[PDB]
Design a binder for this molecule. Structure first.
Ligand code: SF4
Ligand code: SF4
Ligand code: SF4
Ligand code: SF4
Ligand code: SF4
Ligand code: SF4
Ligand code: SF4
Ligand code: CL
Ligand code: K
Ligand code: K
Lengths: 760, 174, 759, 174
């Protein structure tokens, strides 16, 4: 009707397998078995070391691919089930809502159209989308059972399929809440909100929300608005429920990212803690009890052994909680849960007044003095190997700065305390030593904008595909960083200053907002929120990541005038060959992060992760030296062309910020770059490499096709280097390259990996 | 008691063997095409001097992370190659990869000055996928690298003096 | 309204949590962390040794519960996806059909009615049922994401919930195929088919089917009937596809269980191998190639890197496979797959003549002679710790019996060969030594009967609840046995001889059929296939397990006149308090086996597993010494009564056949046993304990409420033992017990765990 | 090199320590309420004579699997209790369990003649769940029980005579 039905409507495992092999022929799976064993069945435990086969016949590599498929399935299920739950309640509580994404957006859900072929008109039209994903999830989960897939490649394909389903599941969830709750719909001037551990007014009743599902927090805000309490209660969140709450009310605040959760809970600033689902400290009941804060659990994924009081009156629930007879309750009715939370936080504020939670000065002094500076105890349990013992001894001798420096490097996991015989509360000792800095952590972040406007696509489409806009930089993912939260700030700041399109989501968006420049501005305060070069965009929560894929799709449909209906392979190939983009999950930790990367990769966008990302076991790495791996068709005539490694990798882990920033620029190169675009992209890659690495890349000429590609300011020394250092045949007098480039340049090179797109 | 830097890094039954500095040195000496792999921790404790002393014995260096900056600032960049740790692992286990000089793969990989948890996974990639031809990967770093073939035991940072004494003995033995 | 809607229609995670707590307050979760670490997120790898919490806050026990939840979710997905796949194919290839289970069954789908509240009329009416399961699967999977549930107990409830969904998914899948393909509908005289490594006629083209999805095998049989090839081609299967195929054709045969798979494939008897999904050797392409047998893959769960030739002509596929330019193909169209397999096996049968696959006499000799009798290589890699080296040296010295003995103990996993530097094909060396016995493996098994008939429920209902039929013994599950395949045969034999109702499924049913008694008869040949005491019944494949649940539900509905519509908790409580039953998965292995046990446990039925079952990490064990754990309500007045441990455990692993058989009898006691029923059950428990353990249980008097409960033949001696060894007040002259029993016998005692059933 | 009977049974970082027969015997001797746990493998190689000799020192025996038959056949059943290994583990980790004589729990559990992979999981249960009060679990069997606190190394079945010399030394040290 509205478009011809493409070849892959609601695909199953094999429907897009041939596209996956195009990806994997180039970026072959790479495996690092964090666990060289398998525990999944009673034939085990099987030792797979060195490439052996398990008792079921499954070889080591295929088990690694099976493992990441399971991780992707857990992530995909988390996003899909989040969307399903939200829809189920919106339809029951508020009712069906026509999907109106604004005048500046025609394609409501590019991913939905792209994968299912459906043009959704009402929220109820997403039910068949969810029915398809849930059926697919059970199909692929069946595949991880013992005695199923034996090819590691076909498992990767299954993982890629789960990733694609995750990108669809993310999209269904965000549009559903955007529409039901009238969140921003591409607002380039979205309001800015306060963020940080030190941005909370401790003088007011403080309600803390943790999780990802906003439905319960919507009832909190609506209850507060109904009884005129927005100036009286301080509502803040940790993790994505915070982003979705401030999208609903710019009067709320954000405490911080996952790494901050434990430290804020322990501070005892919160009088009541309302949790929903996903990325919540699994010991939150113990932690909340410790600070005399009632816990309200609102989602059946996480009940914590608490009584289900959904059918009890709010009066009776409050009585139970204020009395302390129960330390928390389950309220699966979000309307009721919002009333209880708001009424309860006012009563508890008074009751908890005066309480002390962090060590006193004397307690602090005792802890650092009793520390035995063990050679290998707490440092060995710490995922970052922080020098806790030495810091303790320094503080015992009057120097607390070593301990204070650990606060931002710590990810708030609590493993150190459990191997310490002295029972020192290390997490609290670090916090105490850093109180001044914690209290000064006061940033400003733009609220989640959601989709990219079709107008923005019309503006950036051509210069993005040409390369003159040097790429979309997507800083997303969890906060299991190797070296603190400032790295993602420096990344976003570096690339926005170079006029990239910088978008952020989830914890990354939060952590980038914590730092201020010499003018005391955060990135969100300094730069506009348009989807345009030189702008900073908070796309939103983790589910909002689907808007990035949507932006790349809208380019293919709006600028390139390609059909998207059930046409995944064609668009993915277009994005891979023409849309300069790179994802960055510097602290990737969760299963959701693995499924997000999978769905980003399948649609043709590379992703860098941090050094913890090796623990996912699998990566997708190219061999820039293998000529046959870099052949692309010219769709005009069908000829095969050997291209530069652009992008060189599909999913790669870097070790340091200084390595990662040049790598991100490198992964924005695309074979269809014109001279001016390649020059813009190469200028930044060469300068960023020289700035952070102190030397130009050993193989930079690979991205030079003609003289018009070299950065203008140093075009002549670059020409000299090519000749004298790379043995290129160059006429320096004429400023002309005679021989050396990997290929000739042609503005009309119709790059494609798909035989079906060849015209002659 | 061998303590892995991450107590939870108990990967499987084939656990790296404690080796003397002399034995680690001789394994580099005996290799036909050894490769020294350094990471971001080489930029501390004058550890790059030890890496340069090794390189100056005719051994190529893979400068992972941003360690190439330290080699640039030190004035030794010959036979030193910028490369990512991840792509390096994929390359070493690829029998068709002809190395940084184009002459072939490497039969011995030695890690030094590397972030523990990523270098460990780098070592586990080689142990599990570089099997034919076999590539031997060893650690001369301050950590017990349970994923290495041969390694030192854990030397805490407050005992970095002792680590340097052993690392110097490795250099003497090459 | 055929029935009033009960309180738990299409239940979510919290809707049956209170029932789970009733189970778990009595049978508390027990944990043995096979792995003490967690690798699921980059904050890891976390050491949880000794009860520590991970980097996400989750403590050791809650991680163990999460692990078993993932396992159950994988098993639940396998059954649900199998049914969805079959239904979609059936509705497209054959169309919709009315669910007609025959005039001997009124409740077509007891579990569907019990859980969803739906009374299905057509196959298409299972679509909303699958929609429900699949939605729930995604909800609970969401719960296993980092930073979710923190209570180990609530995760166990999520696993129980997944287990219930699995029992529903099993019922859907099987009803669908029973109805779509007219499989037996409770046939007490269902046909017998040949089974075993040695029942195959090697002189005919041999097609081997492996997996669980029978749809491609239906097309094979159908194609063979249409072309008059049923007497010219030998069609046999391994694992459940073999059961479902013989349910369609009594002309097919069954090679055997999972443990036999690798050995049969390595034998090279098969000219063509057609696989579908689940329990297939993941290296089956390698193994097929080695024997020059083309592989036909028919399901997207398992493609093995093969080219998808679903759209190619059957002619072109055969040409490719015959010519050898591809070792196999994927064909997702089952009609085409069947045609190719049948046409191809006739061609390959001729091309494969003259091949030799197992070691020759001389090769066998060189292998056993070159073995170094390593102290700790192959034996350490073997899951059963088999004495391969010592067996090899014995053969080198001229004694092959040690090696031959290993064939049945071996579970065909192949781990031993990979640690042998001498490169001895250990699996094939054991096979060669046992060739005579392998070729003599010719058993007889009754075909999968599927559902229990309503008339059978009415015949056994009262004697089962009162106890005079001493229980349902359900031998099911995989073949990762500790000590060979005869154990399950001996359990089935012992209980049928004692007039239990003995039902079997999957690999268990297969393995029990390989043995013959002194008169040369298999259990399925000697005993009737009626659902009745003293009968042996092959319910069917692993999805057919749901018919066991269904039988217990029908006892509550037909014999006790309870409503089942969306009334799960009341029916489960009924089964736990009155239906003497016990499952046995002596070789439990798969994720499907964990979800089966979970769904069986949730409806109130205990399960014993083999010693490998500790590797699931979690069990459900009672504390018979804790009085407050065994309190039930007398529904007559709401009073609380302490009951004997009956059943003592919910999910428990035993180590040896000799421990397991007395345990199973013990786990059939129920608080509502009458005097005659308890007497029947206690006679067997005491005699079985003496037979297999050489001594009566230390605490057997716990099951004695009155003298009438005592076994008749030794009543006077038991009364003396009660008086002089247990200190009970017993009048030996009057032959009457005065004091000692745990509780007074009261025929009207209405035992229930549910407050809402108090009148 | 300590070889677990199942090479994949690398459970975590806290691995059973190798102990002399005399040290294993003294641990039973020093225990206030020790328990000998035997399995089906006690019915072989005259191993039940050692169990009985241990029992006759005043130590209760938990006869798991069907091991009770060998005690009945041997004529030694005093202070020998029939029980499943599974329920025994759950009971030992339960501080409120008053044991087989009703006087209290056991502070030391020693395994002998048990099926490896089930006995190992029985040991892992106690190691991880019987922490307060701490119950020490040791192995005097022929296997290297990585999940025990203290254990012998692996002794092959063809070297059973060696295992019996070591076990006999345990008995003499109680
Ligand atoms: S699933 Fe396979 S590799 Fe894993 S434990 Fe079972 S037999 Fe071993
Ligand atoms: S809480 Fe912080 S200091 Fe402690 S182990 Fe975790 S990251 Fe390290
Ligand atoms: S484990 Fe405790 S005593 Fe030891 S160095 Fe760490 S904080 Fe200090
Ligand atoms: S580390 Fe993970 S995959 Fe390995 S045994 Fe443990 S739970 Fe299983
Ligand atoms: S999910 Fe929790 S226990 Fe597991 S690796 Fe991650 S932080 Fe550790
Ligand atoms: S194939 Fe048989 S003998 Fe070999 S390891 Fe497996 S069970 Fe043991
Ligand atoms: S590993 Fe090989 S050589 Fe050693 S005992 Fe086993 S079969 Fe013999
Ligand atoms: Cl194109
Ligand atoms: K560490
Ligand atoms: K073994």
């Amino acid at each position: 009707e509205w478009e011809p039905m493409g070849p892959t409507p609601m695909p199953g495992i094999v429907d897009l397998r041939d596209w996956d092999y195009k990806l994997m022929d180039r970026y072959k799976p790479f495996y690092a078995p964090y666990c060289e064993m398998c525990c999944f069945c009673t034939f085990g435990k099987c030792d797979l070391t060195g490439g052996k086969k398990g008792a079921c016949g499954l070889d080591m590599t295929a088990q690694q691919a099976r493992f990441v498929t399971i991780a992707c399935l857990i992530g995909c299920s988390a996003h899909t089930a989040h969307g399903r739950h939200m829809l189920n309640e919106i339809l029951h509580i508020y009712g069906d809502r026509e999907i109106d994404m604004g005048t500046g957006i025609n394609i409501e859900a590019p991913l939905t159209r792209l994968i299912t072929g459906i043009k959704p008109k009402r929220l109820s039209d997403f039910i068949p989308v969810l029915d398809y994903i849930e059926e697919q999830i059970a199909q692929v989960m069946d595949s991880v059972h013992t005695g199923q897939e034996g090819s590691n490649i076909d498992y990767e394909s299954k993982a890629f399929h789960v990733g694609m389903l995750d990108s669809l599941g993310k999209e269904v969830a965000d549009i559903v809440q955007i529409v039901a709750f009238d969140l921003p719909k591409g607002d380039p001037d979205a309001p800015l909100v306060e963020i940080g551990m030190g941005c909370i007014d401790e003088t007011k009743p403080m309600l803390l929300v943790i999780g990802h599902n906003v439905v319960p927090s919507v009832s909190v805000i609506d209850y507060m608005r109904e009884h005129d309490l927005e100036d009286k209660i301080e509502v803040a969140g940790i993790c994505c429920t915070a982003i979705d709450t401030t999208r609903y009310s710019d009067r709320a605040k954000i405490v911080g990212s996952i790494g901050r959760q434990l430290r804020f809970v322990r501070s005892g600033i919160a009088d009541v803690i309302m949790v929903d689902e996903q990325c919540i400290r699994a010991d939150i009941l113990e932690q909340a009890k410790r600070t005399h804060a009632p816990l309200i659990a609102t989602n059946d994924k996480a009940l914590y052994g608490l009584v289900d009081r959904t059918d009890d009156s709010a009066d009776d629930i409050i009585t139970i909680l204020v009395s302390g007879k129960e330390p928390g309750v389950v309220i699966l009715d979000p309307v009721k849960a919002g009333e209880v939370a708001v009424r309860l936080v006012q009563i508890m504020h008074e009751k908890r007044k005066g309480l002390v939670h962090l060590p006193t000065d004397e307690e602090f002094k005792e802890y650092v003095e009793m520390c035995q500076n063990c050679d290998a105890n707490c440092v060995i349990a710490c995922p970052q190997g922080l020098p806790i013992g030495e810091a303790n001894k320094a503080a015992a001798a009057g120097n607390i700065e070593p301990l204070a420096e650990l606060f931002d490097l710590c990810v708030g996991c609590g493993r150190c305390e459990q191997v310490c015989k002295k029972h020192i509360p290390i997490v609290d000792v670090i916090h105490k030593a850093a109180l001044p800095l914690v209290r000064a952590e006061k940033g400003m972040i733009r609220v989640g904008r959601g989709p990219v406007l079709d107008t923005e696509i019309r503006n950036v489409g051509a210069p993005l595909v040409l390369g003159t806009i040097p790429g979309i930089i997507a800083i997303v993912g969890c906060g299991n960083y190797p070296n603190g939260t400032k790295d993602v700030y420096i990344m976003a700041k570096e690339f926005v200053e170079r006029k990239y399109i910088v978008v952020l989501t989830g914890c990354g968006a939060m952590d980038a907002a914590l730092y201020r420049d010499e003018d005391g501005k955060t990135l969100y305060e300094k730069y506009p929120g348009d989807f345009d070069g030189g702008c900073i965009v908070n796309i939103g929560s983790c589910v909002s990541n689907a808007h990035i894929h949507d932006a790349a799709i809208k380019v293919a449909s709006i600028f390139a005038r390609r059909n998207i209906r059930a046409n995944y392979a064609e668009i993915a190939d277009y994005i891979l060959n023409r849309v300069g983009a790179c994802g960055m999950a510097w602290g990737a930790m969760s299963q959701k992060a693995a499924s997000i990367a999978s769905g980003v990769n399948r649609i043709g966008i590379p992703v860098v992760i941090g050094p913890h990302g090796w623990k996912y076991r699998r990566a997708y790495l190219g061999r820039k030296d293998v000529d046959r791996d870099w052949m692309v068709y010219d769709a005009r005539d069908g000829s095969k062309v050997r291209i530069e490694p652009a992008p060189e990798h599909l999913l790669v882990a870097a070790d340091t910020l200084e390595e990662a920033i040049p790598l991100m620029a490198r992964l924005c190169f695309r074979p269809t770059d014109n001279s001016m675009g390649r020059q813009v992209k190469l200028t930044h890659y060469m300068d960023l490499s020289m700035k952070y690495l102190g030397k130009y890349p050993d193989d930079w000429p690979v991205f030079v096709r003609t003289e018009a590609d070299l950065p203008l300011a140093k075009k002549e020394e670059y020409l000299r280097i090519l000749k004298e250092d790379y043995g290129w045949d160059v006429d320096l007098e004429a400023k002309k390259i005679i021989s050396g480039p990997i290929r000739k340049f042609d503005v009309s090179f119709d790059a494609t990996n798909l035989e079906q797109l060849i015209r002659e | 008691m061998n303590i892995p830097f991450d107590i939870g890094n108990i990967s499987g039954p084939e656990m790296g063997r404690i080796a003397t500095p002399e034995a680690l040195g001789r394994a580099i000496k005996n290799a036909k095409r050894p490769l020294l792999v350094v990471g971001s921790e080489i930029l501390e404790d004058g550890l790059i001097d030890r890496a340069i002393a090794i390189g100056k014995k005719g051994i190529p260096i893979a400068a992972t992370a941003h360690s190439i900056k330290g080699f640039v600032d030190a004035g030794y960049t010959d036979n030193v190659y910028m490369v990512g740790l991840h792509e390096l692992a994929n390359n070493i286990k690829s029998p068709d990869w002809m190395g940084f000089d184009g002459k072939g793969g490497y039969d011995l990989v030695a890690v030094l000055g590397g972030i523990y948890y990523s270098t460990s996974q780098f070592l586990i990639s080689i142990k599990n996928c570089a099997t034919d031809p076999l590539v031997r990967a060893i650690s001369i770093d301050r950590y017990y690298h349970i994923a290495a073939r041969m390694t030192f035991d854990n030397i805490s940072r407050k005992r970095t003096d002792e680590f340097k004494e052993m690392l110097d003995r490795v250099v003497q033995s090459i």
